[PDB]
Design a protein around this ligand. Structure first.
Ligand SMILES: N[C@@H](C(=O)O)c1ccccc1
Lengths: 617, 617, 218
């Protein structure tokens, strides 16, 4: 039979070799780099065609290393093959390496959610540090086109690895830049925020742990996750129904609801500070980082405290989580002065990395922190930062007190008073407008800049505001919530929001008229008032004193604006509802446990609630 | 060591017992159904929980059966898990069956692009007809919740498997409803349109034939395919640069550019007619079907002519290709009266299937064709259709002649004249506004309803039009292009467009003012004027008679509108450019072969170009 | 299925809702015009209209009722069917034998927005379709009591004027009572995901308590 007409075999080639590969401006090298313990890890090496001694940019990811280096699958040009955030490193001729971490996708070995460093929690002879160390060692002895210099970077889990590496790095690692890294998953990163559980985790669990490679989400009954989680009951009730009870990590997490030894052994900010890294560091996080707000800022400062003898600069732009590796010209309705993300990547990130990765490049001298001013809409270069804080700073914080008539005042109100609001667990306050499903990345990403008018309109939320500003108020640092709240129940959650009320009217941009834009806000689980490690019941109807740090600010409350403070006791469905009744484990709360409580925020007098603002000149 | 604190194993569970399954209102059975040649086929069986005597709706697909039955992966409800077009059957409590065709994804065996039926082109003991037979046979003997009756359906390739099944169906196949089926890939379905090659095929090849399962697209150099293909030159040159030269199917196509025995042996419309089948059929295709316009209508008609002794209804809605299984309220800027797609599915599709799959159901008596009137905006039930055609119809077609002054008249222009336009291959007319890439699905889908005003403005496109209508003109049937065109070169393509010019002003919808909506248009490869099987060079400057059928219409040109006829010689980058110089195989055209030509469309007299309109009362 | 004055424009959609064609034009061409023609264009064909020509927002089609409504409180062929509120924040057609009550706190300092903030009366784009807006925001509030039936097994059909038989007490001396009859869309609507669980109000109104006995004498 004539093969050109009659086909008996298969129209699928037995072996391909498309010329598309010769039309490329790069070379992709795939190799199972073997780790000390004999476990091999999937590694992708993207080498620019005709590369003579180029620095390597290394990234270890639990998010499929192959695809990470495949923005545009098998792209003709490297620029399209590599992520948006590599633009400056592609422009610079860097080699790009994306490695599948031990246990995920292409790599071998067991996968352990944010594998704790070698210690009480990990007695094996391997960890995310050794693996990183081995990889760098292999990379400098197996990439002839490279110059033996390695730089590390990545966001979230991809940044968590940069930190794990910084614990005990390989000589080759000359410079590191963790971006929105997963440092303290309990204190205020991905899992908990001051003890308050983030229900968004359940999905991620079944997503990254159902199988070595790609998995799926948890099938939902209702399209609105507000309904899904509320109709389910307690966070544990959801996990159980989703079958998460059979997932090892969940079991561990559930077993440790408080900030006990389990979570303390993972606090990379403290652990890293103990090791005192000597490798230049560029810590990055978004001012509106909706996923890892604790990480960077705390690690940078913890190192600053240990007097590290190495570059340690903190960079914070007007971005959401992982926003630095994309376009930062806008976030929600907000608009900034140009692509702030690219801005940093080109004018700071790259030069800094060039200094230690490309012998002969110009030397930079970054200040303690480079932060975007969300008030003046300009980049701020602070030699020493912050200038104002609680203890050990040039100056102290400036308290903005709560006053009568739901107002705010810089003058300590002598008149003793209180404002009550009923917090009904049956009707929790939606962290963002309903409906919302955790799957709605579109809605999730910029949730931290959304208008707070909806919340204000509810009776279970208390709002305080200054008069319309006649002189601008400049704040630069970490504001502190000096809370003197009282609750009818034996437990409670305290959400405190620092807001910048936009001018009553903004004729240039009508939509922003009287927009309540939160510049800093967080939640605090009342049971941990005395000790994070030792949860303890609150005294009903007693005014208890809370003191916690809110996300850093570098903003200006301009004329026409107002400073606003908002307090509530729920944040559904992002955070699981506090039963308002002290229970051993909130994960296992029962229908009868959830109790309607009366909250009273004391203002003025000796127990004067306020926001300790980092006011500067 | 404490396990709930220390993990030495993998956070990834060995197995899973998701309780989500218990909540589901259906069950999924995955079976490796064995064909008569020992080869087993993947078969997803979706059974409504607690089913009894339920009809089976079967679809054989080369597009991953597992994923086909996973609209919302692992969904809690069947309605969710199954595609939009299954709605009426999910509601009916049908057993849904999706099977991977031999050689694709979960299925075993060899893959042969549109595997030719048993005959000169395929001597083996099996084919898509037998596999279907074997499948149906198994289904009715191993699905205990089924009543033994099976109905087959699917769109495109999924509709092609239905036609193959109809060549020799299993006694259990009680009804079939092919949807926009791949019937004649050369004549006017998916590959060629009257000999003109569609450059969209290349991506399809690499995507659907690179591997057994999922594949990928061809990496592009430019974001605009108009550029991509023009720069490469001839379709074959692109295929070569893309690396398609190693794929068997492409080789076979490249070796058969004309309508020879290779394509004639695949003409399912004629083959099915030779077989005189007795299974109730409900043919469907979109009036604006941009992928398989030939299929349904031709196969259905062929059967009608063959005096088929079984139900044979044709259905054509205001949909794009495969638009029948989605919402059919709109199409581009066009808006119809409600979900026309859903309407058909609920009011015709299911009832028809219910009659033969659910014994005891009322009997429906469908007419010859149920076509949606794109002028009156309502469904038309034609007892005998069409009422007008060239040979053997109640009446004939009324010609709309090209006249002087670039007009269109129903009165045969006595005056002999011609209008000429220059067709430069270095500047082909974009089939839709630049830039366009074949990957741009959003633009591809509704390309046939796009404004033709851009073309009109070109010096290489002749535009004719009636005077604003004072009386509406109703057309219902298949318009024929009676073209007397002449080209200076030895080859040429002829694009004829039948357009409905909207009123010069549409205050209720301002954007539609003067809009040039094409109700029917197509292209014809000149070299095939005399014989589709034997290409012949055209005589330079000779008025040649081209006579070919255009897409079927069921429109109405109302007062305020004008009928328009547009003629051009290119349609890039959808259709490869005709070199305008006769070459043995246009696929292998060389840079120098491409020649600028002067096309002259003659109007009036003995060679009066016209559109034989199927005008009815 | 139109908003105010919607008859003189397009009637294919209202807010996120979608209807079968231009329902507004439909009426203008099939009913309005021919009707007028009969009396205005002598010799025209006469039309025989029923009592009510109403569009069905559930069946998605026009309903021609010879005599409408068929059910009502007094003088109709049939009577209204009471959908009783019940403990467990549910609704049942079976009169709950046991007594009961559910409470909420209406704080005038934080009134319920009729539509999401911020809204200015000048925003016509928001005012026009406000009646079909999602009532999920209200439901999440502690100052809005909500009752619902179990996911329907068989459809419940309604045609006529619903009446609110409400027995409520306020700790004050005056109060407004807003009652909302809502059709909750299916938990998940895979064809149109945004509609999933959408709380669509088919009928709602407010009643000033001070006029309970006499609209004339508060
Ligand atoms: N009609 C679709 C399809 O069958 O899916 C198609 C076939 C071949 C090439 C490109 C598209």
């Amino acid at each position: 039979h004539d093969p050109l007409s009659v086909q008996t075999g298969s129209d699928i080639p037995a072996s391909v070799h498309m010329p598309t590969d010769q039309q490329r401006d790069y070379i992709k090298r795939e190799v199972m780099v073997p780790m000390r313990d004999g476990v091999k890890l999937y590694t992708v090496i993207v080498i620019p065609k005709n590369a003579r001694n180029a620095p390597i940019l290394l990234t270890r990811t639990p998010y499929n290393a192959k695809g990470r280096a495949n923005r545009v699958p098998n792209a003709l040009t490297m620029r399209e093959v590599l992520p948006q955030g590599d633009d400056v490193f592609v422009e610079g001729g860097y080699i790009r390496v994306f490695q599948d971490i031990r246990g995920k996708y292409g790599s071998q070995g067991d996968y352990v959610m944010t594998r704790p460093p070698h210690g009480p929690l990990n007695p094996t002879k391997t960890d995310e540090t050794t693996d990183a160390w081995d990889t760098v060692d292999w990379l400098v002895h197996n990439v002839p086109e490279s110059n033996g210099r390695v730089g590390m970077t990545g966001s979230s889990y991809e940044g968590f690895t940069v930190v794990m590496a910084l614990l005990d790095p390989h000589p080759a690692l000359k410079v590191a830049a963790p971006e929105s890294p997963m440092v303290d998953g309990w204190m205020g990163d991905d899992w908990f925020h001051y003890g308050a559980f983030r229900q968004g985790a359940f999905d991620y669990f079944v997503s990254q742990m159902t199988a070595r490679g790609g998995g799926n989400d948890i099938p939902r009954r209702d399209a609105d996750d507000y309904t899904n989680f509320l109709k389910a009951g307690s966070a544990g009730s959801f996990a159980t129904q989703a079958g998460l009870d059979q997932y090892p990590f969940w079991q561990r997490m559930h077993a440790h609801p408080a900030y006990d030894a389990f979570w303390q052994g993972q606090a990379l900010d403290k652990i890293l500070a103990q090791r005192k890294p000597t490798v230049p560091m560029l810590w990055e996080q978004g001012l509106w980082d909706q996923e890892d707000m604790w990480g960077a800022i705390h690690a940078w400062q913890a190192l600053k405290d240990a007097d590290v003898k190495a570059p340690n600069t903190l960079v914070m732009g007007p971005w959401r989580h992982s926003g630095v590796n994309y376009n930062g010209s806008t976030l929600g309705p907000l608009e900034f002065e140009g692509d702030t993300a690219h801005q940093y990547r080109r004018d700071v990130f790259r030069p800094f990395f060039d200094e230690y990765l490309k012998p002969g490049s110009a030397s930079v001298h970054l200040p303690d922190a480079i932060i975007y001013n969300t008030g003046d809409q300009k980049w701020d270069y602070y030699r020493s930062w912050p200038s104002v804080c609680e203890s050990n700073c040039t100056g102290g914080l400036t308290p903005l007190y709560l006053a009568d008539g739901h107002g705010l005042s810089f003058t300590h109100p002598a008149a003793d008073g209180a404002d009550s609001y009923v917090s009904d667990p049956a009707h929790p306050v939606p962290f963002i407008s309903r409906p919302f499903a955790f799957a709605q990345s579109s809605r999730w990403k910029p949730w931290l800049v959304q208008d707070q008018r909806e919340a204000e309109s509810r009776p279970d939320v208390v709002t305080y505001e200054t008069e319309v500003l006649d002189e601008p108020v400049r704040v630069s640092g970490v504001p502190v919530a000096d809370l003197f709240a009282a609750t009818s129940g034996t437990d409670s959650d305290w959400v405190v929001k620092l807001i910048d009320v936009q001018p009553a009217m903004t004729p240039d941009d009508p939509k922003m008229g009287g927009y309540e834009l939160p510049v800093s806000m967080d939640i605090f689980r009342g049971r941990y008032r005395k000790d994070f490690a030792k949860p303890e019941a609150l005294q009903p109807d007693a005014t208890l004193h809370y003191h916690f740090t809110l996300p850093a600010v570098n903003h200006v409350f301009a004329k026409g604006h107002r400073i606003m403070v908002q307090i509530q006791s729920s944040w559904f469905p992002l955070y699981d509802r506090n039963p308002q009744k002290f229970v051993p484990n909130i994960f296992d709360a029962k229908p009868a446990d959830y109790t309607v409580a009366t909250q009273s925020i004391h203002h003025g007098g000796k127990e004067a609630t306020s926001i300790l603002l980092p006011v500067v000149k």
